Amino acid sequence: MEMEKEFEQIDKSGSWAAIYQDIRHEASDFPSRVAKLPKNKNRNRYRDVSPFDHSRIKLHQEDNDYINASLIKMEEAQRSYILTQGPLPNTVGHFWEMVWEQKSRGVVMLNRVMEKGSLKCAQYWPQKEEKEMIFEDTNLKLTLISEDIKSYYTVRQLELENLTTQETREILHFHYTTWPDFGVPESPASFLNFLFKVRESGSLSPEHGPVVVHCSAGIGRSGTFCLADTCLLLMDKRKDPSSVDIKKVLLEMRKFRMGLIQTADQLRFSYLAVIEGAKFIM
Numbered sequence: 001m002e003m004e005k006e007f008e009q010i011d012k013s014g015s016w017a018a019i020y021q022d023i024r025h026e027a028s029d030f031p032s033r034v035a036k037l038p039k040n041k042n043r044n045r046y047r048d049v050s051p052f053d054h055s056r057i058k059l060h061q062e063d064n065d066y067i068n069a070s071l072i073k074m075e076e077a078q079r080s081y082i083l084t085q086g087p088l089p090n091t092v093g094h095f096w097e098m099v100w101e102q103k104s105r106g107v108v109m110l111n112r113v114m115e116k117g118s119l120k121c122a123q124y125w126p127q128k129e130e131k132e133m134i135f136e137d138t139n140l141k142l143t144l145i146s147e148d149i150k151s152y153y154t155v156r157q158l159e160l161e162n163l164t165t166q167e168t169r170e171i172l173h174f175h176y177t178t179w180p181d182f183g184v185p186e187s188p189a190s191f192l193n194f195l196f197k198v199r200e201s202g203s204l205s206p207e208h209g210p211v212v213v214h215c216s217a218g219i220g221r222s223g224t225f226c227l228a229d230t231c232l233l234l235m236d237k238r239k240d241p242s243s244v245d246i247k248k249v250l251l252e253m254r255k256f257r258m259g260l261i262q263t264a265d266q267l268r269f270s271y272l273a274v275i276e277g278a279k280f281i282m
């Protein structure tokens with residue numbers, strides 16, 4: 001079926017939970033043996049969210065190459081994304097090592113450091129120009145260059161230096177700051193405006209490594225971001241945009257990381273975002 005009328009048909013019939021459970025039943029199951037090794041317990045935020053072995057990002061280190069991060073490679077859309085958990089106190093150096101090694105231009109953050117009165121990720125970037133951060137375990141330096149605070153999101157320019165080679169690179173930090181502590185946003189308008197700002201920066205384009213996208217677990221809000229982006233790109237590429245099937249795209253993405261889209265409300269919100277976004281594109 002088309003999307004907008006399939007949408008109204010699920011609303012009128014109140015069957016979002018049944019649609020979402022079907023997706024959960026059909027989703028791929030691949031091994032995640034490296035994630036579950038005892039030496040990696042303090043590298044995982046949640047025991048039930050792990051990268052598959054076949055698609056995990058490897059650190060360029062011979063001691064321990066493990067990080068909770070996955071490469072989502074979308075062949076028809078010609079887009080790739082790295083989805084990862086919010087960094088932990090003992091993985092902030094690994095996080096920036098990955099950004100460096102994978103040649104990423106942008107980092108997309110969809111959570112606040114504290115939500116619901118608890119810490120959802122480490123404070124992993126500097127808050128003042130004159131107070132830079134050094135990650136001694138991976139030999140990197142990170143400096144805040146500029147910050148632009150808007151009503152729904154903040155954009156930061158960061159300088160990442162590999163202290164071993166003295167090479168430097170400019171990284172863009174796109175921080176969506178207004179996702180509610182509970183539920184999903186009422187309107188997709190600010191989320192879509194944010195997606196378009198990331199696109200306009202070059203961070204999603206083939207002349208760079210894959211964008212790094214995270215929330216707390218790296219599957220719910222993060223899944224919504226890449227699902228909406230890929231569906232909108234396919235609607236622009238194909239002769240028949242009504243052939244784009246958001247459930248089929250989500251199942252393709254779940255071949256590369258488990259659990260993408262965590263609730264039926266996130267699934268409905270993803271439909272809403274793609275529907276409204278397709279009208280603005282034209």
Ligand SMILES: Cn1c2c(c3ccccc31)C[C@@H]1C[C@H]2[C@H](O)CN1
Nearest residue numbers: 145146157158159160168169170171
């Ligand atoms: C424009 N720019 C540059 C850097 C940078 C770091 C943060 C923000 C912007 C930046 C680092 C140096 C020179 C240039 C270049 O793009 C890369 N090498």
